[PDB]
Design a protein around this ligand. Structure first.
Ligand SMILES: *[C@@H]1O[C@H](CO)[C@@H](O)[C@H](O)[C@H]1NC(C)=O
Ligand SMILES: *[C@@H]1O[C@H](CO)[C@@H](O)[C@H](O)[C@H]1NC(C)=O
Ligand SMILES: *[C@@H]1O[C@H](CO)[C@@H](O)[C@H](O)[C@H]1NC(C)=O
Ligand SMILES: *[C@@H]1O[C@H](CO)[C@@H](O)[C@H](O)[C@H]1NC(C)=O
Ligand SMILES: *[C@@H]1O[C@H](CO)[C@@H](O)[C@H](O)[C@H]1NC(C)=O
Lengths: 346, 302, 250, 302
């Protein structure tokens, strides 16, 4: 994305203020900079000489270009196998980001038949015609021999509106499409397809964590299709539903849910680990940093930084009666037209 | 003394059992990496009415217009209309105009589907399982003074513990109030919370989570899951300068990223766990009818 | 395998009298207008701003009865008495109690199967104080609710479920094994009959044996409102007794 | 051919892979103890009325007693009785007796609790969703003539397998019906069941069970749960007179006795798992209106 553009800029935030804090703790200076290319770093062969290397922040750390990684690095096994880690300052896991009549008209034709047959039943065996018509108006919605079948139809009308109340409460209350995934334990994602598009950040710790486990191998052959550079591109791709799910940490997705109310996490939570500080080998800057982080944990300064960024956040009945509402608003014109008919007839 | 006294004074090699991590222990021992998120914890036990009113005025105006076509139900059509919204059928009036009868039938269909949607709204409100938290963090004003609020309550800790040292290094006045409210046993405080001889309790997170996950009835529910709290971890304590540290840490981090740690969490932790009451809505009913009779007493001035 | 309604009743007993007083103050009248208020909080039953209060009261009628439709949906529809165990993965049997009476035949295959599995040691502590000798004694004891669970093969339990409705099994199925023929040592009858057993599996003779014994098995709304039905059937006598009191007045 | 020829011609020592067991295979080679339940499988896509009648007679008799007590309340008050059940706001009769007002108040409370219990009844009937299978078993009427029902449908198997041989042991005519309905692949038959190219499919039990478990959307539904099926079991194929038979049998039956086989079935097998339709209730509606016009034709004689 950059032909040649490398500038100084203003950087701030959570780990920046943590860096200012332990810079206040013991006295030292520093040089804050960023990575050349936006990767955490994975153990990967370069395809000349058949040799493993690291890239990203770890590739700049081991090459001497960097000496301390104050950044959200995910502690796992293999990254601890080469360098030393302090105790983690943030504890979280992993989760998934997603984006979160006809027969009545037949009964109306039936009562159009019923009103005619009841008036003919009253006509055969002994303003009255309009009286029985207005009786049919009062019966078909429910706002002596024919009145027996009329009250039978009133029982029909109550049992029909009872079934209508029951299945509307069904359709919008009880049953529900499974919008949730139930986490990593979804059997449909075990053998996925083009309808479940989900992946991870390219060369992140999620890649190694899903490359290790043998019961998650098939998804690893699917999530290698859409590996993304930044998490912002993942938010952008799920934002237009080009994806269908995303695998990322807890507090970052909770902050994005506080940003955007449609970006919603899911129920499950696995891989309980912690963001710590990426450090070098045996160095005199090892015990001091862990003691200072633990001193920041024992007081509420971690909770103060939560108040800065982590804790910091940012029916009505018009759904199926919207068309009914428009029909009620439009029927006033038909009633005025019937007033025109009643004027023009006399 | 204790675990630290047996580790540092070289009668043991490592401390495998459950143990917190704080500053002076990290001075005297060199801990491993943590493996379970175990901080600290505290255990205890709009737009419908306006537009529907405007449509009600529209229906009354059309009733006035049908009277202009054609008895004394000019202003009494509202007592028909909003009385037949609820379909309790107070005897009001029988309309004469045909367009008025069609309008009453359409509005009655609207009232039937409105009460059906209201029953569905009550069912959807009946779906949700609401939770209450009378104390929402360690920085509560209830914890500041039991004279600040009207019931003088109580809160328990454990003696000779790391939680007491964290309180003494973070909140000395809270340690002064905890000095009044000490006790000894964990299960003693459990029985005091079940019978009611204790109100609050302050300890670590996962121990109280496991005690809540195996209790019958599940009265004891925590406050969150460790969000306004210390948020540290349990690990393994070794002697300072032991060569076992790297190997033990690599073995633990291998045990993390395979689900075998999750299998042991399944093996040793349990993840289990109303009536007819609407008295808030009933008090609203009584207060709105008292306001309505007050409005009638205001209109009685003529 | 009530009180709030009483408070609403006393409330409307206040409401009808005070609304009649308010309607008299804002111009057999008393009994007829009280019966009109009876028709207000109920259906019609009988043939100026005080009526406004009455129609406001009409709204409260719905927030009674729809609420009466609401809470029974919380009382019988969604809730369920926890009488299921859902198989071997119940922690109630992993961590037992004094009333969780589960056992089997003493010195059966279930006992060795739970004695080998050391993680099932805890249930092995229970049944040694509780096991029986025959499964029919276990059926008789669980009919009198002296048992509370019974680890057993599925055929006998599903057959007794077809016998009696209260005998209800569960869903999980562990140690999926086979019932076969116990044989002696090296003998040709281990071979011949085995093929004969397979000769029974290839055709529908096992199906016919299922039809003889295995496959062949053997709303109303009166849960708790039947007392209200008895109240409706019995209040007629007291009502007509009050009518004889009204005769004694007239 | 395949594995069995490699065992008979002894270029394969044993066939540990998945393999069905029937009579002729048990003749030509020797098998092990079974380890999984794998048969075959087929894949496709009163008094209340009496007591209310009694209570209706009770209300009618008390209405007769009201007319004898203190104006058409003789027998037409049932038009008030079964009209106020439904709250239709239809005028019926204005009662002039205190007995009538008390009895209609009792009947009104009874109708309110009856409609509330009927809403609960509709909720419980809506939760109970039907799950039926039209084909009972191998002796189906569909399995004798598909044109006897109005669509003549088709159902297939895999070619040249042990299932076809067991069908030919059961019925050669079933093989003659199936001969024009053969196909090639397992997932080819799966997609043919998806896009309507095939209606039913017959194969072994656990394969179609797992394919129903991985069915995207619980769409294709099995028939039964292993009741009307062949009920055989997979084994391990060994040569006749091989010394490894008893050792493999004891090792497998040791592997059953710890739940490890159940753990492997948990790992590799996952058999998981609303609109306006009231055709039973509408059929009752049509039957009761036919009874209503029949009763009107009876009453037309006067
Ligand atoms: C700060 O730096 C000065 C000069 O190097 C040094 O004397 C002092 O000890 C430092 N403070 C601490 C305690 O780190
Ligand atoms: C592998 O080697 C080729 C040699 O042309 C080169 O493209 C690159 O170093 C490697 N592949 C990639 C990442 O394109
Ligand atoms: C913190 O830093 C100083 C720097 O010399 C060093 O002595 C030690 O690592 C830490 N403090 C102590 C224990 O002196
Ligand atoms: C705490 O330690 C002191 C040391 O003397 C001891 O007397 C006291 O009983 C201890 N309390 C408990 C129960 O931890
Ligand atoms: C079945 O028993 C008969 C008894 O004569 C014997 O001939 C045969 O060996 C047995 N089965 C076979 C075919 O091996």
């Amino acid at each position: 994305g950059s032909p040649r553009h490398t500038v100084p800029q203003c950087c701030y935030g959570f780990c920046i203020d943590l860096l200012i804090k332990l810079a206040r703790t013991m006295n030292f200076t520093y040089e804050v900079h960023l990575v050349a290319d936006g990767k955490f770093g994975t153990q990967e062969r370069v395809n000349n000489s058949n040799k493993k290397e690291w890239n990203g922040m770890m590739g700049e750390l081991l090459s001497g270009q960097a000496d301390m990684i104050v950044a959200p690095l995910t502690i796992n096994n293999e990254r601890a196998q080469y360098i030393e880690f302090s105790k983690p300052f943030k504890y979280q896991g992993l989760t998934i980001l997603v984006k979160k009549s006809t027969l009545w008209l037949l009964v109306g034709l039936s009562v159009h038949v019923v009103a005619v047959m009841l008036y003919l039943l009253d006509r055969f065996s002994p303003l009255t015609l309009s009286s029985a018509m207005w009786f049919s108006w009062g019966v078909l919605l429910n706002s002596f021999s024919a009145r027996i079948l009329g009250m039978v139809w009133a029982g029909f009308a109550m049992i029909i509106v009872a079934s209508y109340t029951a299945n509307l409460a069904a359709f919008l209350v009880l049953d529900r499409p499974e919008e949730r995934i139930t986490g990593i334990n979804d059997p449909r994602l075990r053998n996925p397809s083009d309808k479940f598009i989900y992946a991870t950040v390219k060369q992140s710790s999620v890649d190694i964590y899903f490359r290790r486990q043998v019961e998650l191998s098939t998804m690893y052959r699917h999530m290698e299709k859409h590996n993304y550079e930044s998490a912002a591109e993942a938010i952008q791709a799920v934002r237009d539903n080009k994806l269908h799910a995303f695998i990322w940490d807890s507090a970052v997705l909770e902050f994005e849910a506080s940003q955007k109310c449609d970006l919603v996490t899911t129920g499950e939570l696995f891989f309980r680990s912690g963001f710590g500080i990426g450090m070098r080998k045996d160095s005199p800057w090892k015990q001091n940093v862990s003691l200072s982080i633990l001193k920041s944990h024992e007081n509420g300064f971690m909770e103060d930084l939560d108040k800065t960024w982590v804790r910091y956040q940012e029916t009505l009945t018009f759904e199926n009666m919207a068309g009914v509402f428009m029909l009620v608003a439009g029927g006033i014109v038909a009633g005025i037209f019937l007033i025109f008919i009643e004027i023009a007839y006399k | 003394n204790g675990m630290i006294g047996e580790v540092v004074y070289q009668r043991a090699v490592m401390a495998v059992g459950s143990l917190t991590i704080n500053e002076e222990r990290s001075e005297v021992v060199d801990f491993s990496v943590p493996f379970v998120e175990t901080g600290i914890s505290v255990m205890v036990s709009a737009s419908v009415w306006v537009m529907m009113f405007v449509m009600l005025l529209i229906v009354s105006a059309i009733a006035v217009f049908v009277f202009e076509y054609f008895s004394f139900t000019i202003g009494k059509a509202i007592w028909l209309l909003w009385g037949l919204v609820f379909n309790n059928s107070v005897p009001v009036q029988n309309p004469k105009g045909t367009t008025s009868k069609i309008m009453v039938s359409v509005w009655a269909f609207f009232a039937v589907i409105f009460l059906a949607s209201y029953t569905a709204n009550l069912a959807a409100f009946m779906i949700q399982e609401e939770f209450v938290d009378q104390v929402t963090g360690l920085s509560d004003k209830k914890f500041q003074r039991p004279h600040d609020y009207s019931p003088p309550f109580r809160f328990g800790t454990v003696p000779n513990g790391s939680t007491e040292r964290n309180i003494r290094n973070n909140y000395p006045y809270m340690h002064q109030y905890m000095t009044r409210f000490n006790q000894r046993g964990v299960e003693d405080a459990l029985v005091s919370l079940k019978t009611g001889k204790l109100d609050a309790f302050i300890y670590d997170a996962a121990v109280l989570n496991y005690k809540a996950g195996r209790d019958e009835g599940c009265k004891l529910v925590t406050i969150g899951s460790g969000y306004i709290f210390a948020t540290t971890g349990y690990g393994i304590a070794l002697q300072k300068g032991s060569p076992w540290k790297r190997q033990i840490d690599l073995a633990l981090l291998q045990f993390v990223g395979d689900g075998e740690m999750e299998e042991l969490e399944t093996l040793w932790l349990t993840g289990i766990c109303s009536s007819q009451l609407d008295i808030d809505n009933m008090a609203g009913v009584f207060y709105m009818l008292a306001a309505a009779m007050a409005l009638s007493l205001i209109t009685f001035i003529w | 395998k009530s009180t709030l309604w009483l408070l609403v009743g006393l409330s409307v007993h206040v409401v009808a009298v005070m609304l009649y007083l308010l309607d008299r103050f804002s111009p057999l009248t008393l009994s007829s207008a009280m019966w009109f208020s009876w028709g207000v909080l109920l259906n019609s039953g009988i043939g100026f701003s005080a009526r406004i209060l009455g129609m406001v009261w009409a709204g409260f009628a719905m927030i009674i009865v729809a609420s009466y439709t609401a809470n029974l949906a919380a009382f019988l529809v969604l809730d369920r008495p926890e009488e299921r165990i859902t198989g071997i993965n119940d922690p109630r049997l992993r961590n037992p109690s004094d009333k969780f009476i589960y056992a089997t035949v003493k010195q059966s295959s279930v006992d060795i199967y739970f004695r080998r599995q050391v993680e099932l040691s805890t249930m092995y502590r229970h049944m040694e104080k509780h096991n029986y000798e025959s499964a029919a004694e276990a059926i008789q004891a669980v009919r009198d609710n002296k048992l509370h669970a019974f680890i057993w093969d599925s055929a006998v339990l599903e057959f007794e479920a077809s016998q009696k409705c209260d005998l209800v099994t569960t869903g999980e199925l562990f140690f999926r094994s086979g019932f076969g023929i116990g044989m002696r040592k090296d003998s040709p009858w281990k071979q011949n009959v085995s093929l004969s057993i397979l000769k029974s599996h290839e055709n529908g003779f096992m199906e016919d044996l299922d039809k003889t014994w295995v496959r062949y098995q053997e709303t109303l709304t009166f849960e708790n409102m039947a007392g209200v039905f008895m109240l409706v059937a019995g209040g007629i006598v007291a009502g007509i007794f009050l009518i004889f009191i009204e005769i004694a007045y007239k | 051919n395949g594995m069995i020829g490699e065992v008979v011609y002894q270029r394969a020592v044993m066939a540990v892979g998945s393999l069905t067991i029937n009579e002729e295979r048990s003749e030509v080679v020797d098998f092990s103890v079974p380890f999984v339940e794998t048969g075959i499988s087929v894949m496709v896509s009163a008094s209340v009325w009496v007591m209310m009648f009694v209570m209706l007679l009770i209300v009618s008799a008390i209405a007769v007693f009201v007319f004898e007590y203190f104006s058409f309340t003789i027998g037409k008050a049932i038009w008030l009785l079964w009209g106020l059940v439904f709250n239709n706001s239809v005028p019926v009769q204005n009662p002039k007796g205190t007995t009538s007002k008390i009895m209609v108040s009792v009947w009104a409370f009874f109708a309110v609790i009856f409609l509330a219990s009927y809403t609960a009844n509709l909720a419980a009937f809506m939760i109970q969703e039907e799950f039926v299978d039209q084909v009972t078993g191998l002796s189906d009427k569909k399995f004798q003539r598909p044109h006897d029902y109005s669509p003549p449908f088709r159902f297939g198997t895999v070619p040249q397998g042990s299932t076809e041989r067991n069908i030919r042991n059961n019925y050669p005519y079933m093989h003659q019906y199936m001969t024009r309905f053969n196909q090639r692949g397992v997932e080819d038959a799966l997609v043919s069941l998806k896009t309507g190219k095939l209606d039913a499919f017959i194969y072994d039990a656990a394969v179609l069970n797992y394919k129903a478990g991985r069915d995207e959307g619980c769409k294709l539904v099995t028939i039964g749960s292993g009741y009307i099926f062949a009920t055989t079991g997979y084994g391990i194929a060994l040569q006749k007179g091989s010394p490894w038979k008893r050792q493999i049998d004891l090792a497998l039956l040791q592997f059953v006795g710890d739940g490890e086989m159940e753990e492997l079935e948990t790992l590799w097998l996952t058999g998981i798992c609303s609109s306006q339709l009231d055709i039973d209730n509408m059929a009752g509606v049509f039957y009761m209106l036919a009874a209503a016009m029949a009763l009107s034709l009876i009453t037309f004689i006067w």
